[PDB]
Design a binder for this molecule. Sequence first.
Ligand SMILES: [Zn+2]
Lengths: 112, 135, 108, 87, 246, 156
Amino acid sequence: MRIENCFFCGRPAWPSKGITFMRNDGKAFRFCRSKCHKNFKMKRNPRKLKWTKAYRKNAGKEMVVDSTLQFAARRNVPVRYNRELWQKTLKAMERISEIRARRERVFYKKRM
Amino acid sequence: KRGAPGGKLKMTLGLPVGAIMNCADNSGARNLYIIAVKGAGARLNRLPAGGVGDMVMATVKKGKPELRKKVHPAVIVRQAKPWKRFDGVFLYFEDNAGVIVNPKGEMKGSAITGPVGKEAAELWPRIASNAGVVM
Amino acid sequence: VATPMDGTTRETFIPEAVKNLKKYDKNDPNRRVLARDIEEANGGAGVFNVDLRKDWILENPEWKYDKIPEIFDGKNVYDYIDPDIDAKLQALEEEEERLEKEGFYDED
Amino acid sequence: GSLAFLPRKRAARHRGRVKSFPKDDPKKPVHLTAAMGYKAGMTTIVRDLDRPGAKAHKKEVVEAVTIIDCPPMVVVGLVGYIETPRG
Amino acid sequence: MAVRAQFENSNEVGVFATLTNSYCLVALGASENFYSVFEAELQDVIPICRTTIAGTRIIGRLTAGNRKGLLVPTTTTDQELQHLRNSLPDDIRIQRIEERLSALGNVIVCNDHTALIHPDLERETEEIIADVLGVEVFRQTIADHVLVGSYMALSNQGGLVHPKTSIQDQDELSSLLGVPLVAGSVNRGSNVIGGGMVVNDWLAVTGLDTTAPELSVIESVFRLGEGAGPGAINTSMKNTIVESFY
Amino acid sequence: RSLFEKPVTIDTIFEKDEMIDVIAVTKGHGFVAGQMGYHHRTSVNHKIYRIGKGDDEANASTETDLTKKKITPMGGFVRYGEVNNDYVMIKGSVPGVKKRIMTLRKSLFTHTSRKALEKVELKWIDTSSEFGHGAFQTAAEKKQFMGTLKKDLQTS
RNA sequence: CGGUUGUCCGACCGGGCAGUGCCGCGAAGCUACCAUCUGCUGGAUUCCAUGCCAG
Ligand SMILES: [Zn+2]
């Protein structure tokens, strides 16, 4: 199963949660709650509503740089099984969750 | 065998009897007029609402003069009413669209324009053949 | 009837394996295992559960029969599987000591 | 409404009698037949379907379940029932 | 060596399956009889894998590929993406691509050397089908129809093209492909061949509705059997073709 | 006799993937030809999916996700609270309202069904905020996303 | 929660107001053939068991 990123609301939506809209040209949108659903349905610009996450991506309140963000990317080629590969990935994630959390703290200290 | 699909459980039906939904293939039609839904139940005072991917008796009201006022079976390939897909996906199209298909499964034109519904290309195999975009 | 102006043909990748197998004849007693002899011995079309775990090919035979991780703490491990993710990981702590050697975690 | 449930009347007891038990045979192992729980709430489930004949094989059914809390059951008493021509 | 097979009620085997040289890919279903058939004509010499692509049973039109590579769209999931890689050997590369034209089995048709693409594909997309599939790509419509996969099935020994193509069109297509081509119909005169037919380097599987003369041209054009038909069989049996297709 | 004054658990009596009939008194349609609601009703043929523990603290996780978590959602179960004890989890719409007695009884028919003998294997439990449209599993992953509130920084 | 109003009391702080001014998002509650779950059990030649409902 896959976590879909909400296009407008920026929420990490899950299966059985949210709504989906496709247009005839063939670009895909997944929505989290019904509020952002009617936001794109009312032609609201996501770069005009202040609570959208991608607004704060351009606003500079949220990070754009450093390799942990480059770690956040969608893979393309699958990889065969190896049990050690999961634990060396899985125990990295408690490190990944730790380093992202302390980067949140120091950057907000930098803001204020 | 009667013109009833086998393999479609149910989605949220949103196209009832007396609905105008625009054509999708290159037969020459602009819109199709829904007049009867095949395989629907027999309930009093209930309009037979046709779901997407289901055969519907149809008539061309507006189109080219060659096939104007020609009545023939068709299947719905797109619907704009929200419906529940099997993987937890509530989803819908921009409009309500369909393609003119014979009772056996053959279709009059050559190519289907626009996207094609997931279950419509599943329960009809050669619809997926004629679909350039199906998701 | 088609005929190219150049009149060239490429090389056909016909293997010697499939060249010398035996044809399919239904009256053959000494038969292959057959998914029809599998389906009927274990039930009907709606009885026997078809086994994916018997069909994979792997280097080490007991990677089989093992459940896989899909989601971990709300971030897709499948979107975060990388070859040499060890190699990036000690690369990921190479900054980590100079972050604390510089030490921007102190309170002023 | 169904005739098997009308006329409509409120439950005279809040807990509700079980009214029927499974038939007993000596050949089975000893086990109990029921338990009480508390209706806590209800959530959403995705599941890998493995039902033969189902077009949703090896795929993700989305289903809704209920969460019934069950505290450990303290046993206080025992009762025995003897059989009589009046029941 | 072309055998007749029925999935459920429809004879379009190319819609439900992708059969290539190094692998044969069929669809999951209640009746595993094309798992039976695809091991019957392939006695455990290539990997026989059944799959579901993007939650769909229609894998022959949602997946393009050759012996060198395999292509899947965005709509698949990583459970299905891991499904393709591990059931396949280490010698095959499988790539997942971003595109608007999700039905890759209709807009991409390829063999072990060449490829053809729907004419409105974005520039970054031919360069990833080139370096994974190991083949080169042309750009040419089929009788003003842009679904190259569904309207034509490709093999290195032959190819069946859409019947109403012009003589000048099929000649230059056979010139730019370098393949002996024939304009003919299958599935009792159906206009869709690639959806209706799937063929690999040493066999073809057809529908029971298909008749003997169109079995014979597929026998002759794809150089099946003992290799006795190079296309001169079609010229020798032209009278049978003329009488059947008049 | 051996049962006297000891706590017995749902593991002792019940088990997993078991077809189950369930007994309740239904919802009262009160405060707007007669009574409509709060009736005795024994719902039969429901499927047990899982048995929880409470003390394991990783109850709402399966083999797919290593997220050590409980079945309670954000805000707790609304109008009930935060479950800390053993729980069962049944597929369907089991009758009754929250905070109600809930009697489960073994299937009456001894003839089993393949829908009963079928096994059942989790992927996730939706524990998002059922008070509204929540979109997180746990609070540990919540503050990983939202960053620092100004009230969180002033408090800290 | 955010935004937006006008009437009259000459005017106005303010009142009488629009018999609760309006418009976006959202909660609860009601709900939905507009959503989801369960639907049983046999025998005899209508009746017996069996389940459910009432007691
Ligand atoms: Zn609203």
